[PDB]
Amino acid sequence: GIISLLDEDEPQLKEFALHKLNAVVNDFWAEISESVDKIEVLYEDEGFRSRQFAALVASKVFYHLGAFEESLNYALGAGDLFNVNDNSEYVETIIAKCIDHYTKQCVENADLPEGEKKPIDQRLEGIVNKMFQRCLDDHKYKQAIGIALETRR
Amino acid sequence: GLRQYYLSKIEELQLIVNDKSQNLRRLQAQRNELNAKVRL
Amino acid sequence: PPGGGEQEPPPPPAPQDVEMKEEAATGGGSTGEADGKTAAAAAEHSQRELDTVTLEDIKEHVKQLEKAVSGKEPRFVLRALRMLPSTSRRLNHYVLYKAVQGFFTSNNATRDFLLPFLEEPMDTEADLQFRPRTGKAASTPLLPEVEAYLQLLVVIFMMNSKRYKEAQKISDDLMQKISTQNRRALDLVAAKCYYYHARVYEFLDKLDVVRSFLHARLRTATLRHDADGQATLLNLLLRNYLHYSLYDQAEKLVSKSVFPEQANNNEWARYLYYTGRIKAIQLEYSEARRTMTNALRKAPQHTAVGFKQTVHKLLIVVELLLGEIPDRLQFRQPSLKRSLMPYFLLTQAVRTGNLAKFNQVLDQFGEKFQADGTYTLIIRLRHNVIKTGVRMISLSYSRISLADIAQKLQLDSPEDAEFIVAKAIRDGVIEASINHEKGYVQSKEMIDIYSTREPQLAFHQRISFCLDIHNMSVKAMRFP
Amino acid sequence: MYEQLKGEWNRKSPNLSKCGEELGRLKLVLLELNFLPTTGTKLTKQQLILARDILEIGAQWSILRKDIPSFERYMAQLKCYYFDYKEQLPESAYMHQLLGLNLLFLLSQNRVAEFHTELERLPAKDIQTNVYIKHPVSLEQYLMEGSYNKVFLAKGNIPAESYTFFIDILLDTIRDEIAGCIEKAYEKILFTEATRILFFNTPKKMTDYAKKRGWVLGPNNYYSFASQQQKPEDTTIPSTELAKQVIEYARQLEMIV
Amino acid sequence: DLYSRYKKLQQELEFLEVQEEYIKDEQKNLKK
Amino acid sequence: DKKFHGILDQGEGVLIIFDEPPVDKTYEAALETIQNMSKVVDSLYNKAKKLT
Amino acid sequence: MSEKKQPVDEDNWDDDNVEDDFSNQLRAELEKHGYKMETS
Amino acid sequence: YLASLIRSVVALHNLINNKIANRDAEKKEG
After folding, report:
1. Domain region containing C451
2. Which of H9, H16, H23 sits opposite F37 (nearest CB)?
């Protein structure tokens, strides 16, 4: 019962649900299958101040179920609390389907920059120069030059 | 992290190579038998 | 000493005869042709490793006096195995330890001496980058420790030997796993040690933090290689998730890891069976019986096959649930005949219309069904007994009283004998009406079923099917 | 020892000014420790045996006030507690009467799939022992076949607790079912026979069913509309589909693939 | 150089997809 | 004895007489091919199953 | 060969269908006919 | 349905006619 902690209207459980969503982050990623709205409507609730953290554990369930764009769109909506989490062997799958979705998106933008272009999310490109910051620091460049053709930027 | 993803995609793109060439290996030999039938 | 000195001295060298030809040919090959040039999609060292698991399953039985295997470990573990000019002395070291067993006495490893038999990958310039050696140089001692399992103050020696292989497993997951098949040839060494990683733990230990490590193992799987890493990490994911109540079944529905598209003909065969029981246990009947059948006709030609003693039992559990029944003893064996007689007596009751005949089985063999772990599907056959019977009676008798069918089905009540017939029509077993005022249930006689469309539906399933196998005979022919 | 609760829980306090204080008391559980199963400190059970006794009685009054969405909240949390392999009480005087109580209400919830996946958790506690859980699984067994009277003989046999709200929903899902099964191919039925096949003597509830569906109110009569005549004699529905299929035969017959 | 591994094996499907079509239409045309 | 075919009634003695040569040629002369072809696949065991 | 990773451990057919019908029904039905004459 | 049933058996007899010319030349020729 970690899914039904996102029910109540009182605000004092809202900062106790973030006390009780991070503790249960380890194993039971298969049980949030039936809690899409209970993340998303409670993502739209202002009481649960760390609304983006609900999208962190929502990014944990849909890899375990294999809805790879649903983990991707919820890694987009997980904000700074996903931007702070990038040193993992979990996260190297869902920062990276992003780049797969990113490198084909701006191919379509390099085709037609004249009108009806798809809206750049600026979190879509917010990690790409941030991944280039790793290329600015970790001294590997034969992979770094290769995004810069494939990014169409 | 980034390039970590890319060696997934080189190795399953290669899975199309080993059987469609195997289809072509089957297919190209069929023409050579049929062209040997014609010229003879 | 005469009863020793004629029956003990041939157990050292004649295994030394065959162990200079099977894993020394594997060590002569899979260090220089797995770390070396290549072992391609058509390799031999995997099937050679398939030859060096099965032979040693029933090879060793004894506690190894005369150091006949207890002296093999101080031989086979002092191995650098770096390159040919430094192993030309090691080709002498295959013979230098032979007189150590013969001229002198070695250290007889009897349940205590495995601790100075594991710490050697520092001794004389050994490495772990050559994991086509060291993953096999794990498994060449990691198998015969755990092959007998011997379960008497040994488990920690099996554990620390796995820990050194788990150290090789982390270097597998992180360090240079590409085109050397460092993942591929050690995904088998992952998979084959997992069954020795489990029967330790299914005997005396826990089960579940390995599962999160297996999720971390499934993490890097299909993330660098999409061949035999998607396959064996999911049957070994399922193997106690079925026996547990954790979610794990609707997860596997929407999971992308359903198709690894190739799993070497024996792990692929049971793969359709572990998920074949999942649809069986959560009420998906008609979809299950075709992946139960497909999980049967892809298995090899062994005789002591006690899991096949289960799939032939389970495959027509769900077909009793659907109505169809084949002859189950059509391949009856001296080892199948005793494993069928309680369960064959069950389907004897199903083809009959008697009601408490089901009860005469479920008290006689109610304990046997819980040993096989199948009772929860057995308990619901009474819905299928009564629909078999109401089809049986309505087709035989045309105008039968409803106050006669209950006495024949020993229903003890005519007042719900109308009511099963109501659910027989609601399900659609029999068509015709019931004179509830009188009491007879009349049935209409069948009409021209020949001039109905439905035998073409018996054809169109099989017209299109028989053109497929003619196409598959074309697609599989012209390889030359 | 941080209880605040041991005075007004056994006696009935029906929807009084306790439940908001009770949830605020369940708030003061959550400041001290999470209801994470606490794998360490097995000796400390006051967060485990004393705190869950609050949560099992918290599910008990969740049915008496007709609070259905908040009822499955507490019972799912109790399922995540007996999942723990840590040694607890094996049961109490409530665990049969609460776990099988979820079995009896999910019976009413019209989801038969979760009715049968419970059966992993207790293999022997259904037939050979635990007769109080034999009664719900034998009930839905009796609902599976046509048997209706043996179902309401089990409405003469309620042994454990009241089971009131569950059998009254089990009334309603049987009311439309007979109103469903009055619609088979029957003859005239007078206003006595099918008047008493559910329960009722002679209220106006029969007109509430006789005007809902057919079988028209007449001179002691239920009129039979067993026509089933309009649908047959279709050559066209094959002749669209088969003309597709015959060309589909010729695709994998001549054209090399 | 995996982006150089991608072009060459994008150039593979570039080059292989036409070949399997190229002998496929011979099959009817040699018969004709 | 099938020298004539019909039916006899017991209540009042009514002989409903009917006739049709139904069909015999189409099915059973195509049915025996199937058991001929079954023995061909059986004879495939003596040059394939033994051999490769 | 013959690995099978172990997770756990005419003359015949027509009479089995005939065993299904009279499984517990009048096995030696020989002497009831001697007793059915005076009853029926 | 009879004629398509024949079509599967004939090409299967052709399949062994290629497995007689595959295995019985790799040891002979190489």
Report:
1. 443-477
2. H9
